[PDB]
Amino acid sequence: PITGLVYDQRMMLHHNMWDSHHPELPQRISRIFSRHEELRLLSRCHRIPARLATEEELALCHSSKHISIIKSSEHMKPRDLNRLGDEYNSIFISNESYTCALLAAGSCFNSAQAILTGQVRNAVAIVRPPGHHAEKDTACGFCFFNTAALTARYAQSITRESLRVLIVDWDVHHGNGTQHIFEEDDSVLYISLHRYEDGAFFPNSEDANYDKVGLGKGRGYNVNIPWNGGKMGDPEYMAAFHHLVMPIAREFAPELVLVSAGFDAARGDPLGGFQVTPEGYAHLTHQLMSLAAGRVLIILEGGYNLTSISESMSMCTSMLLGDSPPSLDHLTPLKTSATVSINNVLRAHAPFWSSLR
Ligand SMILES: CC(C)(C)c1cn(Cc2ccc(C(=O)NNC(=O)C(F)F)s2)nn1
Ligand SMILES: [K+]
Ligand SMILES: [K+]
Ligand SMILES: [Zn+2]
């Protein structure tokens, strides 16, 4: 059983020319990679080559206009970059941003291909910029193209259109883009855990609430787990997996699992305010590995404490490699509002998932 790993240092070239200390740093990915080396995890993986996504592949999820505008940034002058970036919610652009986004996506496609052709069992993709906020027609939240959504459609394109893909988004932020892209789709089950705060937390939309269950044939295939009023950590996430994520996933029977693996819910993150531990992320990963005959791709999203994300993601890879799960700390009583969140979701989804009744 082989675990693949993809990483290319050229994804570091995407940078913030006005604010060089912006938390979506180049070194997010070099740090994670270094920690894999340090722990001797790298040498235990098969290295999967990065490549650029093609414009045709982008069109799996994104409009020509969007692709064209971001493509054009490659040749923009500083003023054009700053103004274009400022047309979006929370975006910075440099001349290398487009190519970096292509590299992130194409890295994940190669990884999905390696999994689906049986060359590896599972894989980790250490990529930036992130993807899950990226919409069909717009950039958002440090994301240009929706890497994970693209990877799902890429997987369908090399297997069959109806290949069942579960996307579990444990980044602390709602994947607005991923929700929307698959909102009318029953082939792609989207499950997101996220800090919501009654819509006050980025990206600040009630779309992230538990009552958005999907539209049309996608009804029941969008699962939002919003957290409110609580510094959520390993007990709340373990409870959500037990009561919601795993029961729904098992019943869906995915053929491929993608993890929108942000590590901004991690203890010490400067933005998330949460306290999931490296060991917590290992248990989450271990649980997902029981799905899809173990066909799991972990895709880096957000996460801004360089130490926290390095420890947390390297622990995930350790789980993929088949190492036994570390012990969790003492699971404090589940926080109250978390029970309330889990109950709301149970009631929203019991109509669609018999395992919930
Ligand atoms: C530069 C500072 C720190 C002032 C700042 C805060 N925010 C708010 C946000 C916009 C987007 C965010 C986010 O989504 N983070 N994690 C992701 O999943 C992303 F990587 F995809 S937090 N903007 N700028
Ligand atoms: K999420
Ligand atoms: K869906
Ligand atoms: Zn995030």
Author numbering: 442 to 798
Direct quotes from the study:
The structure of HDAC6 stands out within the HDAC family due to the presence of two distinct functional catalytic domains (CD1 and CD2), both zinc-dependent and exhibiting differences in substrate preferences. Over the last few years, difluoromethyl-1,3,4-oxadiazole (DFMO) derivatives have emerged as a new promising class of highly selective, non-hydroxamic HDAC6 inhibitor. The inhibition mechanism involves the formation of a difluoroacetylhydrazide (DFAcH), which is generated in situ by the HDAC6-catalyzed hydrolysis of the DFMO warhead.
ITF7209, from our DFMO-focused medicinal chemistry program, was chosen as a new molecular model to further investigate the mechanism of action of this class of molecules. It should be noticed that this compound features a five-membered ring (thiophene) directly bound to the DFMO, a moiety that could induce different electronic effects on the ZBG and lead to a different binding geometry in the catalytic pocket, compared to the phenyl ring of ITF5924 (see section “X-Ray studies”). Moreover, the smaller cap-term of ITF7209 reduces the interaction with the binding site rim, which may minimize the potential impact of the ligand on the protein conformation. In this work, we report a new complex between zHDAC6-CD2 and the ITF7209 derivative, which is a novel DFMO displaying a previously unseen binding mode. The CHF2 moiety lies in the flat pocket mainly originated by Pro571, which is buried in a local interaction network between the fluorine atoms and the closest residues. Lastly, Tyr745 exhibits a possible halogen bond (d = 2.37 Å) with the fluorinated methyl substructure and a hydrogen bond (d = 2.51 Å) with N4. The comparison between the new structure of ITF7738 and that of compound 13 shows that the chemical nature of the “parent” DFMO does affect the binding mode of the resulting DFAcH. In turn, it is very possible that the specific conformation of the DFAcH-zHDAC6-CD2 complex dictates the relative prevalence of mechanism 1 or mechanism 2.
